Amino acid sequence: PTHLSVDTKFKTEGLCVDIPGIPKDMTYRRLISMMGFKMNYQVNGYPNMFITREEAIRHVRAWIGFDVEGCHGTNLPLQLGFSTGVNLVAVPTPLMYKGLPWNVVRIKIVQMLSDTLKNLSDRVVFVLWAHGFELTSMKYFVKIGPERTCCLCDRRATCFSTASDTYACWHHSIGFDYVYNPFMIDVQQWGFTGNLQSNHDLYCQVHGNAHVASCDAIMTRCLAVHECFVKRVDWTIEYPIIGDELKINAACRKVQHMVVKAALLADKFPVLHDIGNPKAIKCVPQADVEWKFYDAQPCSDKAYKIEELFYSYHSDKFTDGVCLFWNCNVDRYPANSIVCRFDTRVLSNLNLPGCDGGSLYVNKHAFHTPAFDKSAFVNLKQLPFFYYSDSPCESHGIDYVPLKSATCITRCNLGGAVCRHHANEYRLYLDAYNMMISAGFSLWVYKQFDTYNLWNTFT
């Protein structure tokens, strides 16, 4: 049991307003045939256009919400809406395009999907709240057949061109007119009462209903993300490497060690309360401090309330020493904190739009993160960049230009001239730091933090 059986039943009640008289008894096999597609008894990697919820979750980067609204059914124009915010009008003869025939609409669909997905996924998954017109419009821009490879590379084929009779992936599809072997899932099969807007609005106030197809496409994908990543969580699902995952993760570990080590040296806290991941390890193993751990899994719905994490009777005195919240999202951080908080607004191939202002951050595992909120940090300040090292000044073992920097906190810089080793380490640390920041992470610290206190740790 890996793929969705074509003989599985499909509930058709949501389809009967656009398609009156539709049989109540229906399989995916008969639905696909009714959509104008012929599977021809083929064992060539594409057993069904539709996929399971488990397969959709594994391919969350490929999700594109899709909706079709009747403008006036082969006689009338159709408004095609996508979760990218695009609306196209197809004439049978928040971006809103005027009515055009299918032969040009399909070229725009291929360009839009290719630009959106080339750096995210090897496929497209159309996320539907199926009412009928969207299923019957697929024959006008989709072609199916055996699984194929790109004509210019080793990636799987996602597009087809009638002009050249060739196949291409999302990276090599310029000028292609058909979406090839797309996947789809109908959210209405999951068991819901009431319409799309009433189910979506139970969990999200950020997406409105301006009565255009793209608004429904956006709400559909949002509801699907809430169901699969907010109310249900699975950290055992692995996602492929598509960008700077390894560098970002290594940079995060370097920055955490640096910041925590310097905070402990500068203010000499007798105790550190490490709140977050139940699998956390001491990020500064040689620090003198009393290290105490408190378990909290990553919150995927609303940020934790500091009153619930800390109160209801542990050192109990979280006010003693310092609190470390490394990706532990809370409503309001205490004044004595060191914080790393992911900024959900960041634009990247790792960060996908999420539910109710939140974002789905996908880096090895998928983490739905509650919306970034500047008021969470009212008791803290932004942590400034700095590099600290007490390691000996010795090169060992890439040409040089001497480093001059007020933020290189080393014995050599205190003594007037940065050594080659600390200049190389400073530049590598600045690169790791910039990588973590640009990935979306933000760093905050207690207001008394001052790197001027680190210079006397060299005596």
Ligand X SMILES: CN(C)c1ccc(CNn2cnnc2)cc1
Binding residues for S-adenosyl-L-methionine: 274-280
Binding mask 398-417 for Zn ion (x = CB under 5 A): ------------x-x-----
Q: Is 134 a catalytic residue?
A: yes
Which of 18, 59, 67, 186 is flagged as catalytic?
A: 67
84 in contact with ligand X (CB under 6 A): yes
Q: Is 18 a catalytic residue?
A: no
Among positions 153, 246, 414, 417, the unique one binding Zn ion when judged by CB under 5 A: 153
DSSP bridge pairs for 82: 66
220 in contact with ligand X (CB under 6 A): no
Residue with tokens 């397969």: 55
Q: Is 290 a catalytic residue?
A: no
The angle formed by the CA atoms of residues 427, 431 and 434, to the nearest 5 degrees, is: 135
344 in contact with ligand X (CB under 6 A): no
Instruction: Copy the structure tokens of residue 366.
Output: 């998928």
454 in contact with ligand X (CB under 6 A): no
User: Nearest-CB residue to ligand X?
Assistant: 83
Which of 18, 177, 186, 216 is flagged as catalytic?
A: 216
**Residue 413: CB minimum distance to Zn ion, A:** 7
Helix (H) or strand (E) holding 343: none
Binding mask 103-142 for ligand X (x = CB under 6 A): -------------x--------------------------
Orientation of helix 420-438 relative to helix 245-267, angle to 10°: 110
Q: Is 211 a catalytic residue?
A: yes
Residue 293 phi/psi, 5-degree rounding, is: -100, 145
Nearer to ligand X, 116 or 136 (CB): 116
The listed partner (Zn ion, ligand X, none) that binds 353, CB under 5 to 8 Å by sort, is ligand X
User: Would you say 423 and 408 are in contact if contact means Cβ atoms under 8 Å apart?
Assistant: yes
Residue closest to 320 by CA, chosen among 269, 283, 274: 269
Helix (H) or strand (E) holding 421: helix 420-438
**Side-chain-facing half-sphere of 435: CA atoms under 13 Å:** 19
Following DSSP, what letter does each residue of 215-242 receive, concatenated? Answer: HHHHHHHHHHHIIIIISS--TT------
For 343: left if phi > 0, alpha if psi spans -120 to 50, otherwise beta; the answer is beta
* Residue 297 DSSP one-character state: P
The listed partner (ligand X, Zn ion, none) that binds 393, CB under 5 to 8 Å by sort, is Zn ion
The residue ranges that bind Zn ion (CB under 5 A) are 150, 152-153, 155, 169, 171-172, 204, 207, 222, 393, 410, 412, 419, 422
The residues annotated as belonging to the active site are: 67, 69, 134, 211, 216
The residue ranges that bind ligand X (CB under 6 A) are 63-65, 83-84, 116, 221, 347, 352-353
